[PDB]
Design a binder for these strands. Structure first.
Length: 49
DNA sequence: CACTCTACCGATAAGCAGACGTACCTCTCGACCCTGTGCT
């Protein structure tokens, strides 16, 4: 709205860090796929479905 | 028929050992030996 905020903001430069935790590295979904040979249950791990 | 010395099955603890330990998730990195015996 271009309107002047009622509160005054604490604004300034701050040193931030990008961390090795990226959402796309973590997002995982399984419907069906590989199973363990012995127990025949879904295998472990995002990387292996 | 008053005694006190050993037999008992009891209980006592005793030291023993053996037995247990949040959840779910991501990734990387490394994985026998020793000696008989035929080959050439």
């Amino acid at each position: 709205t271009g309107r002047k905020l009622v509160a005054q903001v604490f604004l300034g430069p701050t040193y931030y860090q990008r961390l090795k935790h990226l959402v796309d590295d973590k997002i995982h979904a399984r419907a069906r796929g590989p199973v363990q040979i012995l127990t025949r249950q879904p295998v472990e791990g995002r990387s292996r479905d």
